C-alpha cells in the first residue's frame, strides 16, 4: 500500500515537517518517518495539497522509514530540485 507522489522541491528549504524515526520516535511501536505538519507556502503546499501523515517509504531510491529521522530529512533535501516521494500506509491515526 504505497502511493507515488512527485513534488517540486524548493531551493534551500522544501516545505514539509517530519516527525520522528528510530533515534527520536513519536511512537516506539512503528519506527517510520512521518510528516506531522505541512510548511505553509513551501513545496508541499504549492505543488499539491496532501495530508501530512504520508509516511515516507522511499524518497528517490533511499530506503527510509526504519532509519534515523536525520537520514530521511537529508534524503528529502538530497532529492535536489525534485522530491520523488513514495509513501506506505502502516499506522494512519
Amino acid at each position: 500500500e504505497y502511493e507515488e507522489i512527485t513534488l517540486e522541491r524548493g531551493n534551500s528549504g522544501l516545505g514539509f515537517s517530519i516527525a520522528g524515526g528510530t533515534d527520536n520516535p513519536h511512537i516506539g511501536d512503528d519506527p517510520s518517518i512521518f510528516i506531522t505538519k505541512i510548511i505553509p507556502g513551501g513545496a508541499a503546499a504549492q505543488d499539491g495539497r496532501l495530508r501530512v501523515n504520508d509516511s515516507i517509504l522511499f524518497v528517490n531510491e533511499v530506503d527510509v522509514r526504519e532509519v534515523t529521522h536525520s537520514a530521511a530529512v537529508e534524503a528529502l533535501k538530497e532529492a535536489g530540485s525534485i522530491v520523488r516521494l513514495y509513501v506506505m500506509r502502516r499506522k494512519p491515526p
Binding site: 522544501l14 517530519i18 520522528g20 510548511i39 529521522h69
Partner: peptide, 6 residues
C-alpha cells in the same frame, strides 16, 4: 521526540 522542519 522532535519534529525536524524540511
Amino acid at each position: 521526540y522532535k519534529k525536524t522542519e524540511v
